[PDB]
Amino acid sequence: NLEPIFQLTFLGLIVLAGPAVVFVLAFRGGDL
Amino acid sequence: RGWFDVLDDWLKRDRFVFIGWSGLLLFPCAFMALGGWLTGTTFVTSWYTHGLASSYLEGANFLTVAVSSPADAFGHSLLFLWGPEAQGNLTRWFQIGGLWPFVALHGAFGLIGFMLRQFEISRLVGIRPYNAIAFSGPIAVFVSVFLMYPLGQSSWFFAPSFGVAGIFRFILFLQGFHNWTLNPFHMMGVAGILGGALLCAIHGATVENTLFEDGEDSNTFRAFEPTQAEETYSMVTANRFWSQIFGIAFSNKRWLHFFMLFVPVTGLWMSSVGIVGLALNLRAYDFVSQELRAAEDPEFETFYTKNILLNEGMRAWMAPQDQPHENFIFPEEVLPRGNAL
Amino acid sequence: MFAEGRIPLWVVGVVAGIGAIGVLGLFFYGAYAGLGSSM
Amino acid sequence: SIVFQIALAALVLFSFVMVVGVPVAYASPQNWDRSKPLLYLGSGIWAILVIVVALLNFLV
Amino acid sequence: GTTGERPFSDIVTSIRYWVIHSITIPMLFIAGWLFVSTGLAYDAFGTPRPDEYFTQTRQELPILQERYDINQEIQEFN
Amino acid sequence: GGRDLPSTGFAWWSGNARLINLSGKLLGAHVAHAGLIVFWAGAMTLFEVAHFIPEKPMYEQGLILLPHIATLGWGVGPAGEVTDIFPFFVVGVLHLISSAVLGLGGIYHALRGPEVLEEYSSFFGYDWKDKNQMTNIIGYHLILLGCGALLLVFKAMFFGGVYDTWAPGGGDVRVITNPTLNPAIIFGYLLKAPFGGEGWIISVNNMEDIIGGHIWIGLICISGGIWHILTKPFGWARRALIWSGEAYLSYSLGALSLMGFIASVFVWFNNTAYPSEFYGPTGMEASQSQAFTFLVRDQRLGANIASAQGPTGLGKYLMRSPSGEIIFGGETMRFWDFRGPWLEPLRGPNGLDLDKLRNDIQPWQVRRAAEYMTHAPLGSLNSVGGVITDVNSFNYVSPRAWLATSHFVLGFFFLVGHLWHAGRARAAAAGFEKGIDRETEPTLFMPDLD
Amino acid sequence: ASLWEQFCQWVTSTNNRIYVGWFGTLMIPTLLTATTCFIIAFIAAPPVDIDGIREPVAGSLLYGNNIISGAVVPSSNAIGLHFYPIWEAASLDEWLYNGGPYQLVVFHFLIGIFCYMGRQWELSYRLGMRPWICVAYSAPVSAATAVFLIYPIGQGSFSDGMPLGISGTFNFMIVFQAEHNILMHPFHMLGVAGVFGGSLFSAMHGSLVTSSLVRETTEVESQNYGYKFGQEEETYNIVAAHGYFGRLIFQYASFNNSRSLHFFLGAWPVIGIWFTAMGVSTMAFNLNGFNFNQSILDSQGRVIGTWADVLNRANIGFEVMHERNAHNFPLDLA
Amino acid sequence: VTYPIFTVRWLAVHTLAVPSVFFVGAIAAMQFIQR
Amino acid sequence: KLPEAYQIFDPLVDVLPVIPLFFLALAFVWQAAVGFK
Numbered sequence A: 001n002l003e004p005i006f007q008l009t010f011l012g013l014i015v016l017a018g019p020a021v022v023f024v025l026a027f028r029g030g031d032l
Numbered sequence B: 001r002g003w004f005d006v007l008d009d010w011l012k013r014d015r016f017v018f019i020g021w022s023g024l025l026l027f028p029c030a031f032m033a034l035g036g037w038l039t040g041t042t043f044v045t046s047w048y049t050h051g052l053a054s055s056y057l058e059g060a061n062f063l064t065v066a067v068s069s070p071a072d073a074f075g076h077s078l079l080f081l082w083g084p085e086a087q088g089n090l091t092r093w094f095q096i097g098g099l100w101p102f103v104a105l106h107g108a109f110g111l112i113g114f115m116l117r118q119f120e121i122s123r124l125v126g127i128r129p130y131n132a133i134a135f136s137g138p139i140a141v142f143v144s145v146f147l148m149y150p151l152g153q154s155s156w157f158f159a160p161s162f163g164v165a166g167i168f169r170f171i172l173f174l175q176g177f178h179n180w181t182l183n184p185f186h187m188m189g190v191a192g193i194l195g196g197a198l199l200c201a202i203h204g205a206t207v208e209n210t211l212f213e214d215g216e217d218s219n220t221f222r223a224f225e226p227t228q229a230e231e232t233y234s235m236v237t238a239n240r241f242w243s244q245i246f247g248i249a250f251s252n253k254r255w256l257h258f259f260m261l262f263v264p265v266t267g268l269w270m271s272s273v274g275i276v277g278l279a280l281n282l283r284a285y286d287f288v289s290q291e292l293r294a295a296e297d298p299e300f301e302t303f304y305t306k307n308i309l310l311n312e313g314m315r316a317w318m319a320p321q322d323q324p325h326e327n328f329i330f331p332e333e334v335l336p337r338g339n340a341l
Numbered sequence C: 001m002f003a004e005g006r007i008p009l010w011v012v013g014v015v016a017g018i019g020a021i022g023v024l025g026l027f028f029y030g031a032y033a034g035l036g037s038s039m
Numbered sequence D: 001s002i003v004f005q006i007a008l009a010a011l012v013l014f015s016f017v018m019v020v021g022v023p024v025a026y027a028s029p030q031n032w033d034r035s036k037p038l039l040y041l042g043s044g045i046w047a048i049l050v051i052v053v054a055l056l057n058f059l060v
Numbered sequence E: 001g002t003t004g005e006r007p008f009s010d011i012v013t014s015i016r017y018w019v020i021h022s023i024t025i026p027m028l029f030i031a032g033w034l035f036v037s038t039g040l041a042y043d044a045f046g047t048p049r050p051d052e053y054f055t056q057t058r059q060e061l062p063i064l065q066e067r068y069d070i071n072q073e074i075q076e077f078n
Numbered sequence F: 001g002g003r004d005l006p007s008t009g010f011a012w013w014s015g016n017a018r019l020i021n022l023s024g025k026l027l028g029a030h031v032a033h034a035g036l037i038v039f040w041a042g043a044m045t046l047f048e049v050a051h052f053i054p055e056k057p058m059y060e061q062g063l064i065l066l067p068h069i070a071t072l073g074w075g076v077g078p079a080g081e082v083t084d085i086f087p088f089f090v091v092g093v094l095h096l097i098s099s100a101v102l103g104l105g106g107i108y109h110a111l112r113g114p115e116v117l118e119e120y121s122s123f124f125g126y127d128w129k130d131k132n133q134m135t136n137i138i139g140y141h142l143i144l145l146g147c148g149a150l151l152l153v154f155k156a157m158f159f160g161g162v163y164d165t166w167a168p169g170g171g172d173v174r175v176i177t178n179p180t181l182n183p184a185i186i187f188g189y190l191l192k193a194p195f196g197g198e199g200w201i202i203s204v205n206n207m208e209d210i211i212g213g214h215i216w217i218g219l220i221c222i223s224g225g226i227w228h229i230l231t232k233p234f235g236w237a238r239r240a241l242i243w244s245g246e247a248y249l250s251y252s253l254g255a256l257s258l259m260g261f262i263a264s265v266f267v268w269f270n271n272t273a274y275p276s277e278f279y280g281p282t283g284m285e286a287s288q289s290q291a292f293t294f295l296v297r298d299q300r301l302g303a304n305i306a307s308a309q310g311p312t313g314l315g316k317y318l319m320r321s322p323s324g325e326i327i328f329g330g331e332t333m334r335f336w337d338f339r340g341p342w343l344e345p346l347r348g349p350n351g352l353d354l355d356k357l358r359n360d361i362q363p364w365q366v367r368r369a370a371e372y373m374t375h376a377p378l379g380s381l382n383s384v385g386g387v388i389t390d391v392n393s394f395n396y397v398s399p400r401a402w403l404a405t406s407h408f409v410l411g412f413f414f415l416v417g418h419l420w421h422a423g424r425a426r427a428a429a430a431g432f433e434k435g436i437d438r439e440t441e442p443t444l445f446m447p448d449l450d
Numbered sequence G: 001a002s003l004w005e006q007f008c009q010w011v012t013s014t015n016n017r018i019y020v021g022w023f024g025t026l027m028i029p030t031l032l033t034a035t036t037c038f039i040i041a042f043i044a045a046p047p048v049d050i051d052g053i054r055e056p057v058a059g060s061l062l063y064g065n066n067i068i069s070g071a072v073v074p075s076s077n078a079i080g081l082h083f084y085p086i087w088e089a090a091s092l093d094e095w096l097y098n099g100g101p102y103q104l105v106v107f108h109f110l111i112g113i114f115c116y117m118g119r120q121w122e123l124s125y126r127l128g129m130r131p132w133i134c135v136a137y138s139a140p141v142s143a144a145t146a147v148f149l150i151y152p153i154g155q156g157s158f159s160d161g162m163p164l165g166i167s168g169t170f171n172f173m174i175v176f177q178a179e180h181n182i183l184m185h186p187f188h189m190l191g192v193a194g195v196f197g198g199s200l201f202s203a204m205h206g207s208l209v210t211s212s213l214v215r216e217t218t219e220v221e222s223q224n225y226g227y228k229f230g231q232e233e234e235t236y237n238i239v240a241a242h243g244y245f246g247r248l249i250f251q252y253a254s255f256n257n258s259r260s261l262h263f264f265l266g267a268w269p270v271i272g273i274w275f276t277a278m279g280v281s282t283m284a285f286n287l288n289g290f291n292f293n294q295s296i297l298d299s300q301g302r303v304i305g306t307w308a309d310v311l312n313r314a315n316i317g318f319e320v321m322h323e324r325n326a327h328n329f330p331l332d333l334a
Numbered sequence H: 001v002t003y004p005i006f007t008v009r010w011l012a013v014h015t016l017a018v019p020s021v022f023f024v025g026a027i028a029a030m031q032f033i034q035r
Numbered sequence I: 001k002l003p004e005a006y007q008i009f010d011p012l013v014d015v016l017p018v019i020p021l022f023f024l025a026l027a028f029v030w031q032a033a034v035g036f037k
């Protein structure tokens, strides 16, 4: 089916969201 | 410079992984043992030796994989790949349990190599070799349990299988058939291990809670320097604390650390002596006086006699599956069991 | 990234840890599917 | 009924955008002049989104 | 305190290590995969496939009993 | 405030200790964590709703939040059958959205808001030594907790009532009209032995007592809130206690450990605030049900269960408790204190009544006993139900088991945390939390013990 | 000044050979009570009807037990979790027959050990120490509380508490395995790691310190006399021990900070024991070890055994025999 | 600067890591075997 | 299950509750990016 596929897409977007925030702050020079 | 000394120089170089002469024995043998165990638990079955699946390939998990002991039909055959059983056929060698002696023997020689490494490095750096002496404990356990016990028994089949649930099976087997808990030598082993853990905990905590104020941070870890000459914690305060709490205390640091070595090592050695006994079925199975009294007096019950009954039940119910080569056939009506259960 | 020519070590750590978490998740998923799943 | 699904997906997309932006906006004092109003704006919009969804729950 | 070799952090933060390994590591992963998925592991190690634990003529455990002739015994077990 | 070891004296792994004196940053951390709590509530509720089969009992489906909502009287009717799935969904949604708001506020305070609040406002600024301000915050929060208790009371009285498993005609959502304000009962609950047959407050067995105790709790909490707003700690309290942020944390940790232990016991034993309709049987209930199931079966087969002696000479089906009551035989003799709505119609003044056992047992009671016996809170860590020697085909672990185990573990580790922080708070107040000063090592000025 | 102040000064005095303290004012009476009763009962208690089936079990030496088989027997299953003090028995003989000594001893012992942990904190405070030895002690206390209090509570009877005897301990363990599969419980696995590793680290630390002792003696006298009580100079060479160990495994795996090393020595067994205590405490609520019975099926659907199935056979054998007369109904729920 | 690439350490690293990754790929593949 | 209008985002509700685990992980990620100062 597609339930694991959709589930994994949501999970991966979530997994990236946090590290993406940290990486953007580190690269653009925001306070950390 | 003779070739021997040139080799000695190369082997004893200061590198990330010290090799030494002992490494010649340790590293290939340790690698064989570890890779054999991983290979067996990943790919190799026990279907023909035990009638059991024992690898990830068959659906088992970390808790249920094992390099299982070889078939009981081989007695104490060393089961070389080129031996008369497998005759050089690697697949058959896997199927008959050749991996068990492979892992056991390479591990025994890797253990030898590791203790030789302890000796070699101690000699090179210029310290006393008490680490090797301490490691003799694990060596005694490995020799007694993985070599001496099965050699006393009918075959390697009754050796512990190199797996988590295999070890648990060995443990329960020793309880049910040998009453190993009742064995005074196991009792001394238990005392040694529990006392070693106690000593570890209490010493670590005592040191951490009698530290000297040597820094300004709430983080006291950065107030130590490995080259500092002075004690980093107060032995005097520690001694007073434990004297008033427990009644007695260490006053000699050297004695304390020697005791921390002595306790678990002595425990391992005593339990190894007990296992040697069990290899010959020389068990501390029973207290004859209580057995006789119970056989005559049907009102006499102790926790000892209860444990005997548990052992009887375990043997009868487990033997047919645990010893499939025996073709034990126990009809349902001969199985011992309590009421309603 | 923040410095040219090298990867930050923490970026490498995050990626490797995500991969390790993924392999562990795959093994735990496999405990419930296929062989060894009791079904 | 498809408008309800569209509003739901919009709310999830804007919640993702918010989850990403809000910590960066609060953690960049230098670009705080143009990210303080956006904050306001976005919050309002997110609020509006929730409201729409709620109403559409009873419309669908 | 370094015995001579390059520090690991240096190596694994370098571009070249990753150009090499973004290939080598997945290649080994998928080689192990294929080793399993082609059935090669079953044949190499003699491990039964799920349909070969029992046969239409042997319904019981194929426990070895012979001390030296295990090849024939295994082949008769199938 | 610094954000590294040299300027704070705390390592990264103790980095939150850096917040002890940054009141605004600490408020941000607290609000963001509250957001995490509310987020989990909402997300877990939505997950459970999504994974809910509304005609299969809740306890068979790994649900711990939906039973809480059902017990409150939302979405359930007689015997606990799920009427409307929408209230569960609304509770989950509301928590999720407010969690978003709480997280935003916590992030604001932790990341951009003022570092400390004391020079911005006297009302929200606080100092740990400010005994008056600390008691003011206790007072505000005591008022809020009293409000929450009265919210439960209002739901039970005027907003549809709560689920009463003891309801006549069958357990059902009913409106509590006569809560017991009688202080004798309410506070004699607190005086009952924490042992078998008494069960200190775990033994509360009727929604009237629960609602009346909550009315009392609301009044006590609100009056204590006002008391602490308008007073400062007395001399005895000032002399006995440590007055510091870590000390207050340690006190709360002790409190939390106590509460966690109590909740684990509560869910394990109590079937009133935790109806077995939603949480499944208690272990005691399941044992009693097995005894009842086989009493009924053997009686239908013709066994005279009154006079049948078992192998030991005690009655197979019935026996006496040590105080004389007629109870189920077998090992379940230990569980004779059990009371459940399906068993009490057969209990007389002396215990189990032979006449009711012989001609009052209903088919629904037989069905309930079978269900409860087969859902005994026994199960493996990988959720294989039954006794541990059973095989893999029954995927069940009681919610009571999950809740009791988790809350016992949390209670213990919060006792450990209390010990850690109480010891540290004392040592820091006395000024030796960083080690023994070599110059003034106290033991060196102490006489030798012998 | 006042009589109360003088008493306070006495109880909290760091000059007492044994520190008393406020926690001591509870520890000492309760521990002495538990000890006196334990000795008397172990020697001379009559048999106890542990299973509540009028099948009394002889625990004391005078009734035919040796030291290994003797025990203070847990109170009767008929009592369950009821409070059974001496004054609730019609006679001392009744109290003894139903296992009252077990309850007396256990309750006093548990009060005493919690007060012992409090007393450890108290003395560390009086001596100006850091306060966390009692935290390490909370691991054994947690385990003892699990086996004497929490497990009986979850199971609904003090009859299911660990007996106060050697063979009784073994019986407890065997039945616990039969009913909960503790071996296959990861918290017990962590406890085993805790104790095996604690012994490993004890041996390792002791051996490295002993190996790196500074020469201060001759080959005739004990090297222990090289250390003098109350010296600040270090009695061993930690840098030489680090050199050895970092070459035994590799450099970065060896501690060179004694403080971090001793923190690790404290933390490892303590955490392991906390986990195994929590394991016992949660199996008290019958959340048992892993059950992989019949997890592996062949393609047709026949079960292929694993070592877990063999372990289950052993567990069943233990289970069907335990308390052989106590069960009337087919499921061991209580 | 300019350290050797291949060493005894390199060999000790790979001797373990390389079969480890191969085995992990094999076990991953195992996860999707059906009976 | 979820009421009918919402079962397009069933696979998102399936993963929502584990998010606080990721926050705990993100704390360590952030500390790793700052070099664990």
Ligand code: CLA
Pocket: A021, A022, A025, A031, A032, D018, D019, D020, D022, D023, D027, F001, F002, F003, F004, F011, F012, F013, F014, F015, F016, F017, F018, F019, F022, F025, F026, F028, F029, F030, F032, F033, F100, F101, F103, F104, F107, F110, F111, I024, I027, I028, I030, I031
């Ligand atoms: C509930 C968990 C929690 C919370 C609420 C906090 C909160 C805080 N910590 Mg912290 N910490 C934690 C766990 C937590 N910590 C853990 C587990 C560790 C061990 C790894 C630490 C170790 C630690 C150290 C070493 C320090 C702190 C510090 C701080 C404070 C400053 C934060 C900062 O400036 O860094 C900035 C980080 C960022 C800007 C990265 C982005 C973070 C954002 C908030 C991510 C949010 C994502 C979210 C999905 C977006 C939703 C927004 C909206 C749409 C809803 C702050 C109040 C510092 C301090 O004490 O200040 C003096 C400090 O030095 N902590």
Ligand code: CLA
Pocket: F027, F031, F101, F102, F104, F105, F106, F108, F113, F114, F117, F120, F121, F124, F125
């Ligand atoms: C316990 C939680 C808590 C506490 C103690 C504070 C405290 C503070 N906040 Mg903050 N905040 C919070 C949560 C909290 N906040 C949350 C969840 C958000 C996200 C919406 C915010 C977003 C926020 C912003 C953007 C700002 C503050 C500011 C402030 C400071 C000034 C307060 C003030 O005078 O405004 C006035 C107070 C009122 C007008 C009272 C209104 C009460 C609320 C809003 C209405 C609802 C009341 C409710 C019924 C009571 C119970 C709540 C219920 C959920 C149980 C102050 C120290 C300001 C600041 O730092 O100044 C420099 C500021 O800029 N907060």
Ligand code: CLA
Pocket: F138, F142, F190, F191, F220, F221, F222, F223, F224, F225, F227, F228, F231, F232, F233, F234, F237
């Ligand atoms: C979380 C809520 C909360 C908190 C943190 C506090 C905190 C405090 N209160 Mg309190 N209080 C509250 C709610 C709260 N209160 C409510 C709701 C009321 C209304 C009834 C009161 C009415 C009140 C009064 C009249 C007083 C306080 C006082 C105090 C201060 C010292 C009291 C003390 O030492 O504690 C601990 C208690 C003791 C040290 C006395 C010993 C109590 C017994 C011996 C403990 C035994 C308990 C037992 C083991 C547990 C079994 C449970 C049950 C069977 C009893 C302290 C800061 C005192 C103060 O300073 O005045 C401003 C004070 O005189 N409060």
Ligand code: CLA
Pocket: B218, F012, F013, F014, F015, F016, F017, F249, F253, F413, F414, F415, F416, F417, F418, F420, F424, I021
């Ligand atoms: C409300 C409860 C509470 C609060 C507010 C605090 C707050 C604090 N504690 Mg504390 N503590 C608590 C409960 C609490 N603690 C409990 C219950 C224990 C017993 C275990 C402790 C034991 C403790 C110790 C030993 C120390 C503190 C310390 C501190 C300070 C800094 C801690 C820090 O930065 O965290 C950083 C966060 C981490 C390093 C991450 C820890 C991760 C844990 C160990 C595992 C998480 C397991 C969890 C169940 C999730 C499982 C994951 C699974 C999926 C794999 C800080 C003020 C330090 C201190 O004393 O400061 C002066 C310190 O040394 N605490």
Ligand code: CLA
Pocket: F040, F047, F048, F051, F061, F062, F063, F064, F381, F383, F399, F402, F403, F406, F407, F409, F413, G271, I017, I018, I019, I020, I021
């Ligand atoms: C009180 C807390 C609690 C309780 C009682 C439950 C109970 C349950 N959950 Mg749940 N959950 C929780 C919190 C809780 N959850 C949290 C915080 C999350 C966010 C991650 C979730 C997300 C979640 C999902 C997605 C699912 C569940 C499911 C379930 C059911 C199956 C349980 C299971 O097999 O898990 C397995 C057991 C384990 C994995 C063991 C966990 C052991 C931890 C690591 C203990 C930590 C030890 C200690 C605290 C370490 C710190 C100490 C330190 C000092 C060293 C069950 C009723 C399932 C279900 O059936 O849905 C309907 C399901 O799919 N939960």
Ligand SMILES: CC1=C(/C=C/C(C)=C/C=C/C(C)=C/C=C/C=C(C)/C=C/C=C(C)/C=C/C2=C(C)CCCC2(C)C)C(C)(C)CCC1
Pocket: B031, B032, B034, B035, B036, B038, B039, B040, C020, C021, C023, C024, H015, H016, H019, H020, H021, H023, H024
């Ligand atoms: C058999 C044999 C042999 C040998 C071999 C070898 C030696 C090999 C090998 C091998 C190997 C050597 C393999 C390996 C492996 C591995 C693995 C299988 C792994 C794993 C893992 C994991 C799973 C991990 C996980 C984790 C954890 C849990 C923690 C944290 C995270 C991580 C992820 C890290 C020869 C040929 C000689 C001959 C014949 C016989």
Ligand SMILES: CC1=C(/C=C/C(C)=C/C=C/C(C)=C/C=C/C=C(C)/C=C/C=C(C)/C=C/C2=C(C)CCCC2(C)C)C(C)(C)CCC1
Pocket: D008, D011, D012, D015, D016, D019, D053, F032, F033, F035, F036, F039, F046, F093, F096, F097, F099, F100, F102, F103, F104, F106, F107, F110, I006, I009, I012, I013, I023, I024, I026, I027, I030
């Ligand atoms: C500060 C800090 C921190 C912390 C943080 C936190 C703690 C947080 C949080 C937060 C939060 C707490 C959040 C949140 C959120 C939420 C959201 C964002 C939401 C939403 C929404 C939505 C979108 C929904 C939707 C839906 C609906 C409507 C219903 C149906 C279903 C669905 C889901 C679809 C850390 C540690 C990192 C570190 C650094 C510092």
Ligand SMILES: CC1=C(/C=C/C(C)=C/C=C/C(C)=C/C=C/C=C(C)/C=C/C=C(C)/C=C/C2=C(C)CCCC2(C)C)C(C)(C)CCC1
Pocket: F185, F186, F187, F189, F190, F201, F204, F209, F210, F211, F212, F213, F214, F216, F217, F240, F241
């Ligand atoms: C709602 C409810 C109810 C009610 C309840 C109540 C009414 C309650 C209460 C309660 C209370 C009213 C409580 C309490 C508490 C207390 C505590 C918990 C305490 C304490 C203590 C302490 C902690 C102290 C300490 C100390 C000492 C000992 C001395 C020195 C100083 C210090 C502070 C350290 C009932 C059951 C009816 C039913 C169910 C529901």
Ligand SMILES: CC1=C(/C=C/C(C)=C\C=C/C(C)=C/C=C/C=C(C)/C=C/C=C(C)\C=C\C2=C(C)CCCC2(C)C)C(C)(C)CCC1
Pocket: A014, A015, A016, A017, A018, A019, C010, C013, C014, C015, C016, C017, C018, C021, D012, D015, D016, D017, D019, I016, I019, I022, I023, I025, I026, I028, I029, I032
């Ligand atoms: C409600 C909702 C939402 C929200 C979400 C959120 C709220 C968020 C988030 C998120 C997050 C919050 C994420 C995260 C993450 C993470 C991660 C993935 C991590 C990690 C990792 C690691 C692997 C680490 C590692 C390490 C360690 C720990 C050791 C050392 C260092 C290192 C770094 C190596 C959305 C929008 C979806 C949509 C709608 C619904």
Ligand code: OEX
Pocket: F331, G051, G077, G155, G159, G160, G175, G179, G322, G323, G326, G327, G332, G333, G334
């Ligand atoms: O009591 Mn001593 O162990 Ca506890 O599981 Mn039911 O109960 Mn009797 O049968 Mn098996």
Ligand SMILES: [Ca+2]
Pocket: F050, I010, I011, I014
């Ligand atoms: Ca779904």
Ligand SMILES: [Cl-]
Pocket: B306, B307, B310, G171, G175, G321, G322, G323, G324
């Ligand atoms: Cl027994």
Ligand SMILES: [Cl-]
Pocket: F329, F330, F331, F332, G326, G327, G328, G329
């Ligand atoms: Cl029974």
Ligand SMILES: [Fe+2]
Pocket: B203, B207, B257, G205, G209, G262
């Ligand atoms: Fe030491």
